[PDB]
Amino acid sequence: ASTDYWQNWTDGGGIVNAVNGSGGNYSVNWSNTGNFVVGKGWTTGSPFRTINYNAGVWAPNGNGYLTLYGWTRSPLIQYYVVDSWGTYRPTGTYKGTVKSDGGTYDIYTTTRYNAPSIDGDRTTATQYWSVRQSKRPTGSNATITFTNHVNAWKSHGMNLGSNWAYQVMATEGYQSSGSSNVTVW
Numbered sequence: 001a002s003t004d005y006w007q008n009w010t011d012g013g014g015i016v017n018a019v020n021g022s023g024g025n026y027s028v029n030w031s032n033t034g035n036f037v038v039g040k041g042w043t044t045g046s047p048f049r050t051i052n053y054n055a056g057v058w059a060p061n062g063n064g065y066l067t068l069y070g071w072t073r074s075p076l077i078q079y080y081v082v083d084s085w086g087t088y089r090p091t092g093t094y095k096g097t098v099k100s101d102g103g104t105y106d107i108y109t110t111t112r113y114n115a116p117s118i119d120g121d122r123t124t125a126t127q128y129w130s131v132r133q134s135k136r137p138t139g140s141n142a143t144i145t146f147t148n149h150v151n152a153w154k155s156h157g158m159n160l161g162s163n164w165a166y167q168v169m170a171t172e173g174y175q176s177s178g179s180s181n182v183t184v185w
């Protein structure tokens, strides 16, 4: 299934120039931001989906994540599969690792108060992370075999909700500037 969902949220800090391009393509050029999340993917996430992307530009100047980004409800859980970042590698409570798609990821949990909610309001968010141990090379076609992460998480006691909200390959930033250009499929 092709992408059907455009994610474009900013807390209003700084400049977030996001372009919804053709197909699965988007770009972001940002300057001195607060928090923002831009990406393309699917309105209804799946634990069985293989997300493909090609980040032709990954140029954060400060904190930016090049990451799968999604939510589940019942219960409310936010998840990430971070392939690359800028000046900050996100971490949390260490749970283990998972190998997937030619990389090794550390698995983390975190609980964030006053976090952006599914719709951009605020909420207490339980978050599951796979974070690559080194930044993934960009500019070639890349796969995130998400089932590998879901299964690894499950095996470490990290169960997702039964109701799936959106699931995107995102640029998230905080307190930074940068450029990204990503095609998702």
Ligand SMILES: O[C@@H]1[C@@H](O)[C@H](O[C@@H]2CO[C@@H](O[C@@H]3CO[C@@H](O)[C@H](O)[C@H]3O)[C@H](O)[C@H]2O)OC[C@H]1O
Binding pocket: 023, 024, 053, 054, 055, 056, 057, 141, 181, 182, 183, 185
């Ligand atoms: O950032 C941009 C890159 O993402 C872009 O790379 C191309 C991305 O698309 C790849 O082809 C896809 C194959 O799957 C189909 O379903 C999609 O519709 C196609 O887009 C292609 O092989 C990559 O080269 O290059 C330009 C960059 O700006």
Ligand SMILES: [Zn+2]
Binding pocket: 096, 097, 152, 155, 156
């Ligand atoms: Zn394990």
Ligand SMILES: [Zn+2]
Binding pocket: 117, 119, 120, 121
């Ligand atoms: Zn709301």
